[PDB]
Amino acid sequence: HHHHHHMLHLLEQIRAYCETCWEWQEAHEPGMDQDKNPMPAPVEHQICPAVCVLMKLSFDEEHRHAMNELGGLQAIAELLQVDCEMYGLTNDHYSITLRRYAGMALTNLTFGDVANKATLCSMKGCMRALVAQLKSESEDLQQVIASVLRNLSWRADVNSKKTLREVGSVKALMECALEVKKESTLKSVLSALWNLSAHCTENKADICAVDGALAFLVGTLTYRSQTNTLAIIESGGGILRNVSSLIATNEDHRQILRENNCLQTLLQHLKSHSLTIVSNACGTLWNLSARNPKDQEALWDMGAVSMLKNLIHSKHKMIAMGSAAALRNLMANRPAK
Amino acid sequence: PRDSYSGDALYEF
C-alpha cells in the first residue's frame, strides 16, 4: 500500500513490456520459429490503457513530480520507441492510439522541464522514431509528435539542438507541413518549426531548401482559420520572420516571396490586433527592407513608410525596434519619387 | 533581428 502504488504499477507494466520485446529480439536463434518466439503485441499487455492513464495523470503537476521521481519520461519514451521500431508505420488503431497517448504524456513531461528535454533528446533511437511518425497516415499522431518536438526545441541546450538537427527533424517537419490537411495538425507542426528555425542558420537554410516551403509559408500569412484562431498566421509568420535573415541575401528566394505577394501581406499584418503578428511582420520587413533597392521601392510605393511611422513609439519592444529598423532602411533609400 | 519563438506547452489538441 505504498502511496504511489498506481503510478508504480503503470510504469513497471510498460517497462516489463519493453523487456518482453527485448527478450523476443534477443531470442532470434536457429530453431526459434514464430511459434516458439512470437512477436509481442501491445494488446497482450494492456499497454494502451496504461499509457492512457499515464497521459491523464501527466496533466497534473503533482503527478508529474511523482512520475519524474519514478523515471516516467524514460519509461514512456522507451515504450513509444519499441512500438515504433517493431511495427513501423502501421495503421493499426491500437498502435496509433498508444503512440498518441505516450506522446501526449511526453509533451506534458517536457513542458518547462530542463532535465526532461535534455534526457529525451539524448535518447537517439527514440528521437529517430518520433521523427519517423511525421509520415504516419494518422494526422492526429503527427499532431502529437509535433507537440513533443515543439517542447524539445524550446530552450534546447547544445546537445539537444545538435540532436534535433541530426535526426533531420527540420526537413521532416517542413515536408510534413506541406502534406497536412487538418488545422490542428498544421498548428502543432508550425509551432515546432517556429522554435527550430531559431536554433541556427543551418536550420533556416534547411527550411528554405525544401522545394515549395517558402511559397507555402507565405501562404500561411493569409490562412483562413475555420476556428476563431490566429495560430497559423502567428507560427507561419514566425517561421518566415526567423528564416527571412537568409532570404534577404537570396535573390531567387526574394523572387518566390514577390510571386506570392509577401511584402503587401506583411504591411496588412502591421494592422493586426495580434501583437505577435505585428511583431513578426516588423522583423520580416526589417530583413526584407535591408540592402535591396527593388523591395525598398516596392515598400515605398505601397505606403510602408507612414505605416511603420505609426509603430515606432510602441510599448512593445520588438515592434518598436523592428518598425524603426525597417523605417530606417526605407528612409535611407528614398526612390527618385 | 532576434529570432522569435513559439515557446512550449502542456499538450493541447
Residue numbers in the entry:
A (entry chain A): 400 to 736
B (entry chain G): 496 to 508
Could you share sentences copied from the article?
Adenomatous polyposis coli (APC) is an important human tumor suppressor protein which plays critical roles in diverse cellular processes such as Wnt/β-catenin signaling, cell adhesion, cell migration, mitosis and chromosomal instability, and so on. By recruiting APC to the plasma membrane, Amer1 regulates the APC-dependent maintenance of intercellular junctions. In addition, together with APC and Axin, Amer1 promotes ubiquitination and degradation of β-catenin, thus negatively regulates the Wnt signal transduction pathway.
Intriguingly, ITC experiments demonstrated that peptides of Amer1-A1 (residues 325–335) and -A2 (residues 496–508) sequences exhibited approximately equal binding affinities for APC–ARM as full Amer1-A1 (residues 280–368) and -A2 (residues 380–531), respectively. To further understand the molecular basis of how APC recognizes Amer1, we determined the crystal structures of the APC–ARM/Amer1-A1, APC–ARM/Amer1-A2, and APC–ARM/Amer1-A4 complexes to 1.90 Å, 2.00 Å, and 1.70 Å resolutions, respectively. They form salt bridges with a conserved acidic residue A1-D330/A2-D503/A4-E370 and make hydrogen bonds with the main chain carbonyl groups of A1-C328/A1-G329/A2-S501/A2-G502/A4-G368. Moreover, two tryptophan residues, APC-W593 and -W553, provide more binding affinity by hydrogen bonding with A1-T326/A2-S499 and making van der Waals interactions with A1-G327/A1-G329/A2-Y500/A2-G502/A4-G367/A4-G369, respectively. Moreover, the G329A mutation in Amer1-A1 and the D498K mutation in Amer1-A2 also attenuated their associations with APC–ARM as well.
